[PDB]
Amino acid sequence: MKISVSKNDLENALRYLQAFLDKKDASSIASHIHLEVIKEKLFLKASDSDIGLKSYIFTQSSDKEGVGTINGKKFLDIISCLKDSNIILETKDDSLAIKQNKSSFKLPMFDADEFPEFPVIDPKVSIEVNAPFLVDAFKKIAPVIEQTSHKRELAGILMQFDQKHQTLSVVGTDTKRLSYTQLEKISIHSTEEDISCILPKRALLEILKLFYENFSFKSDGMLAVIENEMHTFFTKLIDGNYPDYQKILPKEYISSFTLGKEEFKESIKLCSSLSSTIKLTLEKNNALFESLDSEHSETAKTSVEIEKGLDIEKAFHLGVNAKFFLEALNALGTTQFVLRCNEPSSPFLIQESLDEKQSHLNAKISTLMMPITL
Amino acid sequence: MKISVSKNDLENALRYLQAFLDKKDASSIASHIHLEVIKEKLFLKASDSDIGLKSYIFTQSSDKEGVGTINGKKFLDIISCLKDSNIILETKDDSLAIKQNKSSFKLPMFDADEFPEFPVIDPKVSIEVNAPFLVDAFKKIAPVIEQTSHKRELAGILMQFDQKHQTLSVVGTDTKRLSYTQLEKISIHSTEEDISCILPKRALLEILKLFYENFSFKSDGMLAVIENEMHTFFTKLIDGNYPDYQKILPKEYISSFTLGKEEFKESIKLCSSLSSTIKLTLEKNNALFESLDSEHSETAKTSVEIEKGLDIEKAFHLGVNAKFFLEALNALGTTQFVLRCNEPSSPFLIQESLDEKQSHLNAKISTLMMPITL
């Protein structure tokens, strides 16, 4: 091959690709990016059986078309050390030459025939995402999912597509808490009325780096493929049978309290200076927070006034996990939140104020958590 | 005790003290700060046989004088979670109560009688530092000193005081490189005409966090004590007999080249994308840099034009350690540097352009390095 490219364009493409390389063993083609010049475009890809990214940039000049490979980490280290002028890339034999003015480099290429084939699917379901609601949901739900979850299907996020009712439900859970959202009025094309894709957490995190809005999401039940103008990303899906969250959501809630989000964040952070768990006491015009989990003779307490009185006769006590409660509040875009409760020994809900109100750009995440006893 | 203090004042004092606590075992008094209220001042200290800091802040109100202790990490975690209003601190029995409005905390105190005594010295040497030259020297020399240097006295920085000639020499070395500076016109008070203090690296690093200028430095040959208005710091010294750097500095240099600092930094960083060592070739109007240490079939090269010709007939080749060379340049405040050379197999010097010129505020650091062969 022989081309010249913009330094910035190349650098940016290389940064995105770093996360799809096994960088530790440079002698393996898994540490390499595959390169292919084609009619005024350079395509860069890094792939394996589980995950991959294909990107392109435009060439500033193109002289000779072809394919090749190069160590992705070294390539990026080199480029990030160069000036902002254009970079000439040119193969020699099984070596890639890189030149910019007085600076020149060589790196070994591998046999491109060993490079994994970049899959293509024939999609069973597909959507066009024209707003940030989906990545908004991914971002807000991701904290509840542990990547090394020793149970296979909880290690990922669930995308449940309802062709019939044009809804996409997004769910994450570890076993102590569960966060979900139901996205309405989503134009779903699908061969079946119901289908569920489980994205590995690792894939979820890469998706957040690559995509925001104006992308397509397609899947054949085995791989999910996401594309916009510059990128094609894919991931293997996790086998199947995500627990149905709908069955373990409580039917009713005796108590629903509208409370101050930032005051609760501040008060919970404060008590977690000495504990992981907190005792919350709600009264008509007052919220009290006490460290619960703290070591002997270490105590942390605070309270906040509640101006618009709660519908409480005397006092409601609820033991909570401080981090989970904070992360539940972190996931909300409202200044106030609703806490829904029943018995203090039973799971409780945290959601946005006016969660029922419909929006378009953003997702509204609800979180169900198990309480701590006493 | 019973006092109130400014939240910011307290927080800042606590941050400085964190580094003088063994934080991992909270059950040990080594994790605690000692507190003592005295006539409108609160003193906070953390100390051991080797190192310590004593600080104070003014009290906003004082009601009851006394002493006590508290876990430094927990104390800071609590305070950093509070609002900016004043904080009431008040003992109860062997517990410290902390209150700010609706927020209140308790932490256990230990028997203050176990707390290490904060040393005082009768100083054999003393200086007043009214400019940043000393910490400037510390900062520039610190990178060449390895803290876990398995040789005892190279693990610290040397302060050599010449009462006679009113000079303080500061030196650091690992065995491959040595950096030094001679500070002139320093008002030294001392019982002897010559004395040397070796500061442990750990102490050096804390000093950089605490002090800049307008402080005193005193020592009794065993401890060094540094004080300004707010702080008294001390460290144990390292036993003695720092190798005399003066004997291994070359007498003369055949070649002295004035070169571009930033161009050399850029060119060296560039080649170190693929190597730790670089082959430098100086010609009359050109500097060439080639990766030396790089793996087979990985090459990095660049050059820069030298407008004001060097006094070279054909070409001078010098193998260098890239990091050491960069750190040598990092230590210089000039846009140009001088490289002094002799034989390519013999140690060479890097110093500021016009190193001989005298300054007041800043230190001028020179670095002697051993070359790499071929």
Residue numbers in the entry:
A (entry chain A), B (entry chain A): 2 to 375
What text appears in the publication on this structure?
The sliding clamp is a ring-shaped protein complex that encircles DNA with the help of clamp loader in an ATP-dependent manner, and slides along the DNA. In prokaryotes, however, β-clamp is a homodimer, with each monomer consisting of three globular domains, and in this way β-clamp displays a six-domain ring. Although β-clamp is part of the DNA polymerase III holoenzyme, it is not attached to polymerase III permanently like the other subunits. β-clamp is loaded on the DNA, by clamp loader, a subunit of DNA Pol III. In both prokaryotes and eukaryotes, a key feature of this clamp-binding motif is the presence of hydrophobic amino acid residues that bind to the hydrophobic pocket in the C-terminal region of the clamp.
In the space group C2, one monomer was observed in each asymmetric unit, which interacts with another monomer from asymmetric unit to form a dimer. However there is no significant difference observed between these two structures from different space groups, the structural alignment of both yielded an RMSD of 0.15 Å. While Hpβ-clamp was found to exist as both a monomer and dimer in the crystal, the dimer was the dominant component in solution according to a gel filtration experiment. The dimeric ring shaped structure is a biological functional unit that binds to DNA and slides along the DNA. As in other clamps, twelve alpha helices were observed to form the inner surface of the Hpβ-clamp ring, with positively charged residues suitable for binding DNA. The β-sheets along with loops were found to form the outer surface of the ring. The N-terminal region of Hpβ-clamp was found to have more electropositive residues and the C-terminal region more electronegative residues at the dimeric interface. Although superposition revealed the overall structure of Hpβ-clamp to be similar to the β-clamp structures in other organisms, but some important differences are there at the regions involved in DNA binding. In domain II, the loop containing residues 210–214 was observed to be shorter in Hpβ-clamp than in E. coli and the other homologs. Moreover, in E. coli and the other homologs, the B-factor for this region was found to be quite high, compared to that for the other regions in the protein, in contrast to the case in H. pylori. These results indicate that this loop in other organism may interact with DNA, however this shortened loop in H. pylori may not be involved in DNA interactions because of the absence of certain residues.
